[PDB]
Amino acid sequence: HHWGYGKHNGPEHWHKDFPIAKGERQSPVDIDTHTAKYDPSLKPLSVSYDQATSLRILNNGHAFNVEFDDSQDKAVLKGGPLDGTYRLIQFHFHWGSLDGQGSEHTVDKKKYAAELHLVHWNTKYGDFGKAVQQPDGLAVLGIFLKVGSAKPGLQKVVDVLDSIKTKGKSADFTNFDPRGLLPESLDYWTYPGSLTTPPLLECVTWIVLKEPISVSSEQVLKFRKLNFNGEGEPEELMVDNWRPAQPLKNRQIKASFK
Ligand SMILES: [Co+2]
């Protein structure tokens, strides 16, 4: 029926409706650190989020997205392995039912408690919908979350979750600064891949940061209180909304550091 993360509609079934699921450039992948090639030609990333405008937070039934105004070059990513400017459109997380799982990408097979995705689209394509049809249409910054100390900058997000508990609910979410979610270091790995939920389009240049951010147990606990279902439907907690690692196939992971 429609896709999700359960036993009957989970990632192992997606290929029946989205054949690209068994494509040549699917994500996520395991990052083997000893096989990643340091590339001295990669430039440092340039994150300009000082003019970011958040607008709303929404429970879409598979995660929660914070959306931004992308009508102008307000929050952009450039540099790194990218050509051109990429505008931030939304961020969302993937998390687990337990602290030892939740991330999509793994490092030397290590799974983190969660993974944040900042989604950006290539301005040369004019709109998001046109960007997904192109091999270099999106750039996703992935950041791992480990449980330890609370992350002050994530608290405003944690606190509004009660108001978007079920699928289809949304809340005004203005003035949130995504700079409070970045690690100290911008060292990263990069590879060509795809979106990790249907339609699984292979239009993404992934930028995965080496340094995780810490969140407290209580913060991640609130994520696990969300629901997959809509209001008045039987309760199914929103947990484990992560796709397992896919075959690397003909791809090289490059490192911006040694
Ligand atoms: Co994602």
Short mmCIF file of C-alpha atoms and ligand atoms in Angstrom, two decimals:
data_model
loop_
_atom_site.label_atom_id
_atom_site.label_comp_id
_atom_site.label_asym_id
_atom_site.label_seq_id
_atom_site.Cartn_x
_atom_site.Cartn_y
_atom_site.Cartn_z
CA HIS A 1 0.00 0.00 0.00
CA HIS A 2 1.88 3.31 0.67
CA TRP A 3 5.53 3.10 1.66
CA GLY A 4 6.78 3.49 5.18
CA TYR A 5 9.17 1.79 7.56
CA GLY A 6 7.07 -1.14 8.73
CA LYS A 7 7.41 -4.87 8.05
CA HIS A 8 4.92 -4.78 5.20
CA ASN A 9 5.89 -1.50 3.49
CA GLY A 10 9.49 -1.01 4.55
CA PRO A 11 12.65 -0.32 2.61
CA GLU A 12 12.86 -3.91 1.33
CA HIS A 13 9.58 -3.41 -0.49
CA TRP A 14 10.17 0.01 -2.08
CA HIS A 15 11.59 -1.38 -5.31
CA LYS A 16 8.08 -2.67 -6.33
CA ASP A 17 6.77 0.93 -6.68
CA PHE A 18 10.17 2.69 -7.22
CA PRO A 19 12.41 0.42 -9.31
CA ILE A 20 15.22 2.99 -8.99
CA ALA A 21 15.56 1.59 -5.48
CA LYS A 22 18.01 -0.97 -6.96
CA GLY A 23 19.78 1.73 -9.01
CA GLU A 24 23.54 2.33 -9.40
CA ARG A 25 23.74 5.43 -7.21
CA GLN A 26 21.52 4.76 -4.20
CA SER A 27 21.98 6.13 -0.72
CA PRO A 28 22.76 5.85 2.12
CA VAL A 29 26.07 3.93 2.07
CA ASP A 30 28.63 2.73 4.64
CA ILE A 31 31.71 5.06 4.69
CA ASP A 32 34.82 2.89 4.82
CA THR A 33 37.37 5.38 6.16
CA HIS A 34 40.42 3.44 5.00
CA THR A 35 39.16 3.32 1.39
CA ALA A 36 37.91 6.93 1.09
CA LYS A 37 40.43 8.90 -1.02
CA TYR A 38 41.73 12.18 0.28
CA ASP A 39 41.25 14.71 -2.56
CA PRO A 40 43.33 17.92 -2.20
CA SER A 41 41.39 19.53 -5.03
CA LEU A 42 38.17 19.68 -2.98
CA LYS A 43 37.57 23.19 -1.57
CA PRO A 44 36.32 24.00 1.93
CA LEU A 45 32.56 24.20 2.16
CA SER A 46 30.95 27.63 2.38
CA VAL A 47 27.79 27.65 4.54
CA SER A 48 26.03 31.07 4.52
CA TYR A 49 23.00 30.75 6.76
CA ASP A 50 23.04 34.16 8.48
CA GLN A 51 20.03 35.32 6.42
CA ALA A 52 18.05 32.05 6.78
CA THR A 53 14.25 32.44 7.11
CA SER A 54 12.45 29.44 8.65
CA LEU A 55 8.70 29.40 8.12
CA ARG A 56 7.09 26.24 9.39
CA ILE A 57 7.53 22.76 10.84
CA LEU A 58 5.45 19.88 9.50
CA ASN A 59 4.86 16.21 10.37
CA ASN A 60 4.62 14.61 6.88
CA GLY A 61 4.07 11.11 8.15
CA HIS A 62 7.67 9.94 7.67
CA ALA A 63 9.64 12.60 9.58
CA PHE A 64 9.27 16.26 10.50
CA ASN A 65 10.59 18.94 8.15
CA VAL A 66 11.50 22.53 9.12
CA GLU A 67 10.93 24.55 5.91
CA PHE A 68 12.68 27.71 4.81
CA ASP A 69 11.88 30.49 2.43
CA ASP A 70 13.89 29.57 -0.75
CA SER A 71 12.55 32.38 -3.00
CA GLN A 72 15.94 34.12 -2.85
CA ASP A 73 19.55 33.38 -1.98
CA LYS A 74 19.09 33.68 1.80
CA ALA A 75 20.57 30.39 3.16
CA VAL A 76 23.04 28.84 0.66
CA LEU A 77 25.74 26.23 0.40
CA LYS A 78 28.58 26.46 -2.10
CA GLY A 79 32.19 25.35 -2.45
CA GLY A 80 33.24 21.82 -1.39
CA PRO A 81 32.61 19.62 -4.44
CA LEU A 82 29.81 21.85 -5.74
CA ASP A 83 29.62 24.06 -8.79
CA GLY A 84 27.10 26.89 -8.33
CA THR A 85 24.88 27.87 -5.49
CA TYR A 86 22.50 25.64 -3.64
CA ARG A 87 19.63 27.10 -1.58
CA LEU A 88 18.40 25.52 1.63
CA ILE A 89 14.78 24.38 1.31
CA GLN A 90 14.26 22.18 4.43
CA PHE A 91 16.00 20.07 7.10
CA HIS A 92 14.74 16.83 8.74
CA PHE A 93 16.13 13.94 10.81
CA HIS A 94 16.21 10.13 10.77
CA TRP A 95 16.29 8.40 14.18
CA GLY A 96 15.99 5.13 15.95
CA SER A 97 13.95 3.39 18.58
CA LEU A 98 17.20 2.92 20.58
CA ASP A 99 20.39 4.94 20.88
CA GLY A 100 22.54 2.37 18.97
CA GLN A 101 20.69 2.93 15.67
CA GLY A 102 18.97 5.70 13.73
CA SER A 103 21.57 7.13 11.26
CA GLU A 104 21.30 6.30 7.54
CA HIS A 105 25.02 6.62 6.69
CA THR A 106 27.39 4.55 8.81
CA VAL A 107 31.12 5.04 9.38
CA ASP A 108 33.21 1.85 9.33
CA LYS A 109 29.81 0.23 10.04
CA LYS A 110 29.17 2.41 13.13
CA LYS A 111 25.55 3.62 13.44
CA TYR A 112 24.75 6.90 15.28
CA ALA A 113 21.53 7.75 17.17
CA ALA A 114 20.29 10.02 14.42
CA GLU A 115 21.20 11.84 11.26
CA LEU A 116 20.26 15.38 10.27
CA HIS A 117 19.75 16.24 6.57
CA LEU A 118 19.92 19.85 5.34
CA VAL A 119 18.48 19.72 1.83
CA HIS A 120 19.57 22.25 -0.82
CA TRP A 121 18.69 22.66 -4.53
CA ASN A 122 20.82 23.95 -7.41
CA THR A 123 19.70 27.45 -8.31
CA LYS A 124 20.58 27.01 -11.99
CA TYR A 125 17.43 24.84 -12.19
CA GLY A 126 15.04 27.55 -10.96
CA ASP A 127 12.89 25.45 -8.61
CA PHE A 128 13.10 22.30 -6.45
CA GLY A 129 10.89 20.23 -8.74
CA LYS A 130 13.19 20.84 -11.74
CA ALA A 131 16.34 20.27 -9.65
CA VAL A 132 15.31 16.67 -8.69
CA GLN A 133 15.34 15.67 -12.38
CA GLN A 134 19.09 16.47 -12.72
CA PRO A 135 22.20 14.55 -11.70
CA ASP A 136 23.65 17.59 -9.84
CA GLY A 137 20.25 19.02 -8.76
CA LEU A 138 20.57 18.65 -4.98
CA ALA A 139 23.22 18.89 -2.28
CA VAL A 140 22.41 17.29 1.10
CA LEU A 141 24.59 18.06 4.16
CA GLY A 142 24.34 15.06 6.56
CA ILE A 143 25.36 15.44 10.24
CA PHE A 144 25.41 12.56 12.71
CA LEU A 145 23.99 12.92 16.23
CA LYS A 146 25.45 10.98 19.16
CA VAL A 147 23.84 11.01 22.68
CA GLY A 148 25.85 12.86 25.29
CA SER A 149 25.46 16.57 26.14
CA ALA A 150 22.33 18.56 25.18
CA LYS A 151 22.55 20.73 22.08
CA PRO A 152 21.20 24.15 23.06
CA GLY A 153 20.34 25.12 19.47
CA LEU A 154 18.11 22.07 18.98
CA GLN A 155 15.82 22.86 21.97
CA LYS A 156 13.44 25.15 20.07
CA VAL A 157 12.76 22.22 17.70
CA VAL A 158 12.26 19.73 20.52
CA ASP A 159 9.79 22.03 22.23
CA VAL A 160 7.33 22.39 19.28
CA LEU A 161 7.07 18.65 18.56
CA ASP A 162 4.02 18.26 20.85
CA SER A 163 2.12 20.52 18.47
CA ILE A 164 2.79 18.44 15.29
CA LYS A 165 2.39 15.04 16.85
CA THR A 166 0.47 13.39 14.00
CA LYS A 167 0.74 13.21 10.25
CA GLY A 168 -0.42 16.34 8.45
CA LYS A 169 -0.03 18.73 11.41
CA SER A 170 2.04 21.88 10.96
CA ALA A 171 3.10 24.83 13.12
CA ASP A 172 4.51 28.30 12.38
CA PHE A 173 8.25 28.09 13.07
CA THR A 174 9.92 31.46 12.35
CA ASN A 175 13.26 32.81 13.37
CA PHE A 176 15.06 29.43 13.86
CA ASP A 177 18.81 29.71 13.01
CA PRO A 178 20.23 26.47 11.58
CA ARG A 179 23.73 27.59 12.49
CA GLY A 180 23.04 26.23 16.00
CA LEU A 181 23.07 22.68 14.48
CA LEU A 182 26.60 22.69 12.97
CA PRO A 183 29.60 20.93 14.45
CA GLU A 184 32.78 22.95 14.98
CA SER A 185 34.62 21.35 12.02
CA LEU A 186 33.41 21.28 8.41
CA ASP A 187 35.68 18.38 7.33
CA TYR A 188 33.61 15.97 5.18
CA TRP A 189 33.26 12.96 2.91
CA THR A 190 31.45 13.31 -0.44
CA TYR A 191 29.96 10.92 -3.00
CA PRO A 192 27.23 11.00 -5.66
CA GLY A 193 23.95 9.41 -4.42
CA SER A 194 20.16 9.74 -4.15
CA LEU A 195 17.30 10.80 -1.89
CA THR A 196 16.81 8.21 0.86
CA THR A 197 12.99 8.07 0.69
CA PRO A 198 10.76 7.49 -2.35
CA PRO A 199 11.03 8.70 -5.07
CA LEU A 200 14.70 7.79 -4.46
CA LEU A 201 15.89 10.01 -7.35
CA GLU A 202 19.65 9.95 -8.00
CA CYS A 203 20.08 13.70 -8.03
CA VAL A 204 22.17 14.23 -4.86
CA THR A 205 25.73 15.19 -4.13
CA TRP A 206 26.06 14.04 -0.50
CA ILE A 207 28.24 16.05 1.91
CA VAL A 208 28.62 14.06 5.13
CA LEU A 209 30.41 15.77 8.03
CA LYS A 210 33.03 13.83 9.90
CA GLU A 211 32.26 15.41 13.28
CA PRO A 212 28.96 14.48 14.96
CA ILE A 213 26.99 16.88 17.20
CA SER A 214 25.86 15.71 20.66
CA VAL A 215 22.26 15.72 21.83
CA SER A 216 20.93 14.62 25.22
CA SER A 217 18.94 11.46 25.76
CA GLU A 218 15.96 13.62 26.71
CA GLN A 219 16.17 15.51 23.43
CA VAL A 220 16.15 12.31 21.29
CA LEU A 221 13.44 10.92 23.57
CA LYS A 222 11.04 13.65 22.39
CA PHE A 223 11.66 12.70 18.75
CA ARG A 224 10.42 9.20 19.50
CA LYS A 225 7.07 10.59 20.74
CA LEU A 226 5.93 11.61 17.29
CA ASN A 227 3.50 9.51 15.31
CA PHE A 228 3.50 8.11 11.78
CA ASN A 229 -0.31 8.04 11.84
CA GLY A 230 -2.82 10.81 11.42
CA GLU A 231 -5.01 12.13 14.22
CA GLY A 232 -7.69 9.71 15.43
CA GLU A 233 -5.90 6.70 13.83
CA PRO A 234 -4.28 3.97 15.90
CA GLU A 235 -0.96 5.10 17.30
CA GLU A 236 2.26 4.02 15.64
CA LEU A 237 5.33 5.81 17.10
CA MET A 238 7.62 7.52 14.56
CA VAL A 239 10.89 5.56 15.19
CA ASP A 240 13.44 3.84 12.96
CA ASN A 241 12.60 6.00 9.89
CA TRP A 242 16.02 5.19 8.34
CA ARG A 243 16.97 3.25 5.21
CA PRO A 244 19.79 0.70 5.58
CA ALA A 245 23.10 1.16 3.69
CA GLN A 246 23.05 0.37 -0.08
CA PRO A 247 25.75 -1.08 -2.33
CA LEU A 248 28.49 1.38 -3.30
CA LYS A 249 28.78 -0.13 -6.80
CA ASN A 250 30.92 1.93 -9.15
CA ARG A 251 31.45 4.89 -6.77
CA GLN A 252 34.36 6.46 -4.89
CA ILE A 253 33.97 8.27 -1.58
CA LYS A 254 36.32 11.29 -1.45
CA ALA A 255 37.55 12.89 1.81
CA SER A 256 38.27 16.63 2.26
CA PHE A 257 40.82 15.73 4.97
CA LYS A 258 43.50 13.23 5.81
CO CO B 1 16.83 12.44 4.95
#
